[PDB]
Amino acid sequence: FLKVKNWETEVVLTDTLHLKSTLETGCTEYICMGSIMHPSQHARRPEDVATKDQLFPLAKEFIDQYYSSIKRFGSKAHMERLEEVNKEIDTTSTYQLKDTELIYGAKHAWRNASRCVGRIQWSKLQVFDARDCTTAHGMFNYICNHVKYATNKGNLRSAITIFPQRTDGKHDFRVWNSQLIRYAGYKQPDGSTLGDPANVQFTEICIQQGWKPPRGRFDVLPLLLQANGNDPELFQIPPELVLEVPIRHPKFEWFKDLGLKWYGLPAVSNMLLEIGGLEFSACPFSGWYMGTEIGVRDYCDNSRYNILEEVAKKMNLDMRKTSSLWKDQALVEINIAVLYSFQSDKVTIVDHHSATESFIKHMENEYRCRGGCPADWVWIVPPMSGSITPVFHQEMLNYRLTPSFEYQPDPWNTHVWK
Amino acid sequence: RFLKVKNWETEVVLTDTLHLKSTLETGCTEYICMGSIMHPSDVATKDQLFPLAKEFIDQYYSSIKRFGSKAHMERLEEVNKEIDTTSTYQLKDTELIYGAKHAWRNASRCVGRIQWSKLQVFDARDCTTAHGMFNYICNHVKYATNKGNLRSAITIFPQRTDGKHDFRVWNSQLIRYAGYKQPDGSTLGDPANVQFTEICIQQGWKPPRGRFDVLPLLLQANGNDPELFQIPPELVLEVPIRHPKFEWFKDLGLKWYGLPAVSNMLLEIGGLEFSACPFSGWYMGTEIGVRDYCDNSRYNILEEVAKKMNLDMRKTSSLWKDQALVEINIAVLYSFQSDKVTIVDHHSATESFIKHMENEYRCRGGCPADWVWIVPPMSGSITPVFHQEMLNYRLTPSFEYQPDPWNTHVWKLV
Numbered sequence: 153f154l155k156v157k158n159w160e161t162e163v164v165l166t167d168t169l170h171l172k173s174t175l176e177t178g179c180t181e182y183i184c185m186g187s188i189m190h191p192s193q194h195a196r197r198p199e200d201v202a203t204k205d206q207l208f209p210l211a212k213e214f215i216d217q218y219y220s221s222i223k224r225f226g227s228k229a230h231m232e233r234l235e236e237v238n239k240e241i242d243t244t245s246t247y248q249l250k251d252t253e254l255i256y257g258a259k260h261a262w263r264n265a266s267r268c269v270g271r272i273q274w275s276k277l278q279v280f281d282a283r284d285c286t287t288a289h290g291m292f293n294y295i296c297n298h299v300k301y302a303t304n305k306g307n308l309r310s311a312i313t314i315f316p317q318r319t320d321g322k323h324d325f326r327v328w329n330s331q332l333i334r335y336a337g338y339k340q341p342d343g344s345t346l347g348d349p350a351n352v353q354f355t356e357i358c359i360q361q362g363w364k365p366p367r368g369r370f371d372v373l374p375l376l377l378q379a380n381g382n383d384p385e386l387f388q389i390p391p392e393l394v395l396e397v398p399i400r401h402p403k404f405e406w407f408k409d410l411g412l413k414w415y416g417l418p419a420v421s422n423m424l425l426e427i428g429g430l431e432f433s434a435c436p437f438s439g440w441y442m443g444t445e446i447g448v449r450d451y452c453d454n455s456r457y458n459i460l461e462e463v464a465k466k467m468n469l470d471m472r473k474t475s476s477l478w479k480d481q482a483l484v485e486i487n488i489a490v491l492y493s494f495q496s497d498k499v500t501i502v503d504h505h506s507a508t509e510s511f512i513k514h515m516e517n518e519y520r521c522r523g524g525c526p527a528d529w530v531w532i533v534p535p536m537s538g539s540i541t542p543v544f545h546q547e548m549l550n551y552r553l554t555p556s557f558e559y560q561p562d563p564w565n566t567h568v569w570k
Numbered sequence: 571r572f573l574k575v576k577n578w579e580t581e582v583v584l585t586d587t588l589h590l591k592s593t594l595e596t597g598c599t600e601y602i603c604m605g606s607i608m609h610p611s612d613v614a615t616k617d618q619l620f621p622l623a624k625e626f627i628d629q630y631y632s633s634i635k636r637f638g639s640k641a642h643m644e645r646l647e648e649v650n651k652e653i654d655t656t657s658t659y660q661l662k663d664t665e666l667i668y669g670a671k672h673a674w675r676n677a678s679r680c681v682g683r684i685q686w687s688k689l690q691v692f693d694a695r696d697c698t699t700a701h702g703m704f705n706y707i708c709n710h711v712k713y714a715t716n717k718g719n720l721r722s723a724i725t726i727f728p729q730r731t732d733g734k735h736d737f738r739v740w741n742s743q744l745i746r747y748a749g750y751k752q753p754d755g756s757t758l759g760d761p762a763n764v765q766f767t768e769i770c771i772q773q774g775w776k777p778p779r780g781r782f783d784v785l786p787l788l789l790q791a792n793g794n795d796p797e798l799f800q801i802p803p804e805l806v807l808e809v810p811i812r813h814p815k816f817e818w819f820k821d822l823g824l825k826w827y828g829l830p831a832v833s834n835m836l837l838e839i840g841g842l843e844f845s846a847c848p849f850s851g852w853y854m855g856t857e858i859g860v861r862d863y864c865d866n867s868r869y870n871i872l873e874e875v876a877k878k879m880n881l882d883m884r885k886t887s888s889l890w891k892d893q894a895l896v897e898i899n900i901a902v903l904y905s906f907q908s909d910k911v912t913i914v915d916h917h918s919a920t921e922s923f924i925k926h927m928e929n930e931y932r933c934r935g936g937c938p939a940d941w942v943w944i945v946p947p948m949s950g951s952i953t954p955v956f957h958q959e960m961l962n963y964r965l966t967p968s969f970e971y972q973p974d975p976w977n978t979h980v981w982k983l984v
């Protein structure tokens with residue numbers, strides 16, 4: 153047993169779920185790696201060509217968990233499923249999930265994502281089975297339908313589309329984009345950057361693949377889709393599917409003249425979904441934004457759009473010294489505008505006060521029914537106004553449960569072209 | 571072996587070898603991280619104390635380029651005789667200074683460590699009575715305050731012996747405002763300090779029952795009952811909080827004290843335990859402006875400030891709390907700088923800490939840092955530390971938490 157305490161309310165919770173932890177965190181009793189971005193390379197099966205004694209134990213564990221989840225441990229269907237997975241592995245070196253197992257696994261990977269403040273929503277996830285896909289054109293069709301369903305004219309719905317699992321590591325399906333909808337970034341001749349600097353490398357690959365860049369500040373990037381290990385292919389998302397929000401301020405009339413906008417649907421497309429030893433290398437998932445992601449990180453990181461200096465100018469703030477807090481003052485105003493703008497256009501968004509409150513409630517729920525909730529304080533606490541949100545004062549235990557979402561390498565570092 | 575940390579904003583990568591030198595638990599396991607737990611998890615025997623002392627003496631003589639020297643070997647033998655004959659030993663003055671500075675250098679939660687080697691150490695190990703502790707502390711406050719040009723200092727009282735004769739400052743800081751529960755459930759003054767205020771009152775303190783009453787010192791010498799002392803008011807430097815643009819802000823009636831001086835921690839050097847070791851530096855603005863003034867459980871002034879700002883408080887998404895928070899923190903910094911009382915804003919402090927960290931990695935092989943504490947409680951990602959990977963581990967000498975003394979003291983009178 154391990155207790156976590158909220159230092160604002162004095163609520164103490166007791167964690168037993170961590171006893172089911174599978175993978176190393178990176179920490180030891182002598183060193184804590186809680187702020188390392190990727191602390192551990194402890195995986196569940198070697199790189200590929202997993203033998204029977206390597207894959208079957210992972211499959212048995214997942215099937216066991218699913219059938220226990222539904223109160224059917226030891227049932228005929230459970231025992232039948234085990235022998236079924238045994239035969240498939242024997243005859244194909246892999247196995248295939250039932251539709252129910254796939255949905256269960258995708259929801260539990262989200263439920264297990266310790267870095268995610270949005271998991272109160274975890275069991276409301278629309279799962280699109282795209283395991284019949286064979287080509288980049290088919291991937292594009294599946295993605296377009298995902299975007300259209302999830303956007304829902306601004307009433308955003310959480311969804312995930314699951315493309316065929318990895319077989320041998322040479323026939324991977326991959327979305328080369330980091331998100332389905334991102335803005336381009338361009339290296340200027342003098343040395344500055346136009347657009348989004350995070351995406352300069354990916355933009356150059358698109359350009360180097362034939363994409364004609366409009367060379368603007370908010371150029372929706374094309375999709376670069378790889379099916380069955382083949383060379384990736386470019387597709388333009390139909391603009392009527394890409395919902396965008398112009399950013400204005402409820403007090404500063406001049407704010408709109410900064411020419412800022414952002415897109416409504418965040419859709420992460422470069423993670424790997426791991427279920428029962430199976431690896432889904434293309435599994436784009438989407439929900440909706442917390443305001444700070446755009447207002448604090450996308451707009452105000454120094455290596456991102458870096459707009460703090462410009463906003464502070466128009467606000468006529470004393471920018472001579474840091475102690476005037478001109479950065480902090482402009483940062484607030486920017487995040488007010490982002491929220492006001494989304495809310496004005498009826499595009500789903502959550503502020504960091506409401507999101508963190510919801511997450512404290514989700515923590516309650518999880519400790520009550522499940523005996524714990526893995527949570528990464530470093531990621532859960534919002535990047536502004538940390539201590540006036542409830543999660544700042546909440547102790548959290550972090551451990552790794554399966555199914556899960558994992559990082560994976562950018563495919564241009566590993567793909568051999570044709 | 572080596573460990574690498576990366577700054578994701580600059581892509582600077584640093585190599586940590588110093589973590590190999592740690593031999594104290596963090597609390598994490600290989601399968602669970604407790605990096606956000608506030609504290610994870612009578613005194614030492616002869617056999618426990620021998621290697622602890624050896625490691626520290628070895629570290630000291632290595633630091634002065636005298637490892638293996640005749641003086642090094644004689645000091646080890648001298649220390650060993652004392653442990654054998656007395657079950658304990660006494661630090662040399664140079665060792666004490668070195669140890670106190672390195673406890674600071676090793677404090678993984680402290681963002682102000684670029685200053686670590688400029689620490690005035692007051693040796694108070696000859697003190698025997700609470701009156702003596704008062705004198706030592708008044709002198710500390712006066713030296714450290716320096717009419718607003720704050721200087722870092724520590725005063726070190728006698729080390730623990732059998733655990734039955736501890737020296738303790740019962741206060742959590744040397745200067746701190748009282749808090750009073752009211753019968754209607756409200757709180758006057760600082761809610762954080764209600765319990766200690768009650769203790770003082772019971773010991774005979776007559777409270778003014780105001781919003782900013784400087785608490786008395788409650789001082790325990792040699793394990794005796796603690797005794798009350800009033801710090802002379804002219805030694806307590808205070809700053810009235812006003813705002814450079816909101817003329818109404820002064821009418822909030824806010825003030826704070828200029829000298830932060832923590833007095834409830836334990837200083838461990840070579841296995842010796844200094845249970846009374848108050849230390850002082852200067853404030854980072856957010857400590858007062860974000861935590862002291864805006865924590866819901868503290869002075870909790872967000873509502874009143876936001877009211878006077880005419881903000882829409884009907885919905886969170888107006889970010890009225892965030893807007894009021896910045897203005898309060900502007901006022902705190904402007905007020906201290908106008909009165910020429912040393913303070914550091916969080917941007918300047920985090921910037922210096924990154925330079926300190928890099929310097930430490932270059933000259934020492936690492937710098938244990940607790941990201942959860944180093945990142946300021948507001949505007950996190952617009953400071954450089956937010957993007958800095960860090961490694962947390964425990965080196966000694968170190969500052970440690972210890973139980974509040976009223977939970978363990980066995981009383982003597984009547």
Ligand code: HEM
Nearest residue numbers: 262265267268269270273310312437438439440441442557
């Ligand atoms: C429903 C609304 C949701 C909200 C408001 C939300 C909120 C967030 C936020 C703010 C982050 C931090 C992102 C960053 O700093 O880059 C995050 C991380 C994450 N979210 Fe959620 N989320 C939502 C839905 C989902 C869904 C549907 C999934 C998957 C099915 C998911 C999985 C994850 C994962 C895996 C991470 C960790 C990312 C990483 O390690 O880089 N979230 N979430």
Ligand code: HEM
Nearest residue numbers: 674677679680681682685722723849850851852853854969
């Ligand atoms: C010189 C100026 C200094 C500054 C600006 C500074 C800044 C800070 C800040 C902001 C914190 C976090 C406090 C909190 O959030 O509660 C902290 C923690 C800490 N500081 Fe420093 N500090 C300074 C000097 C010192 C000195 C002189 C010492 C001891 C010799 C020290 C030892 C510590 C320790 C041990 C902690 C951790 C306390 C804990 O774990 O609860 N600091 N410092």
Ligand SMILES: N=C(Nc1ccc(CCNCc2cccc(NC(=N)c3cccs3)c2)cc1)c1cccs1
Nearest residue numbers: 349350418419420437438439440441442445455456
């Ligand atoms: N910071 C940079 N790159 C960078 C950009 C973005 C990210 C974010 C990674 N994660 C994206 C993510 C994951 C999970 C959730 C979200 N946000 C959401 N609300 C959702 C997405 C899908 C469902 S909810 C975003 C990290 C580094 C750089 C600046 C300059 C050069 S690189």
Ligand SMILES: N=C(Nc1ccc(CCNCc2cccc(NC(=N)c3cccs3)c2)cc1)c1cccs1
Nearest residue numbers: 761762830831832849850851852853854857867868
């Ligand atoms: N927040 C509460 N309690 C509370 C918890 C922690 C603290 C402060 C703990 N840390 C003090 C500290 C330690 C180290 C450095 C500093 N800050 C400084 N700048 C220095 C102090 C000495 C040298 S530098 C402050 C105060 C009240 C409560 C609300 C309601 C009931 S209790």
Ligand SMILES: C[C@H](O)[C@H](O)[C@H]1CNc2nc(N)[nH]c(=O)c2N1
Nearest residue numbers: 187188189530531956957958959
């Ligand atoms: C070094 C540090 O771990 C890194 O900058 C983290 C900090 N916390 C974060 N928290 C969230 N939600 N997203 C992030 O990208 C980061 N970055």
Ligand SMILES: C[C@H](O)[C@H](O)[C@H]1CNc2nc(N)[nH]c(=O)c2N1
Nearest residue numbers: 544545546547606607608942943
């Ligand atoms: C639960 C969490 O560890 C706790 O609230 C911490 C967070 N980080 C902190 N950081 C600092 N500097 N001071 C604090 O008191 C805290 N509190």
Ligand SMILES: [Zn+2]
Nearest residue numbers: 179184598603
């Ligand atoms: Zn850890």
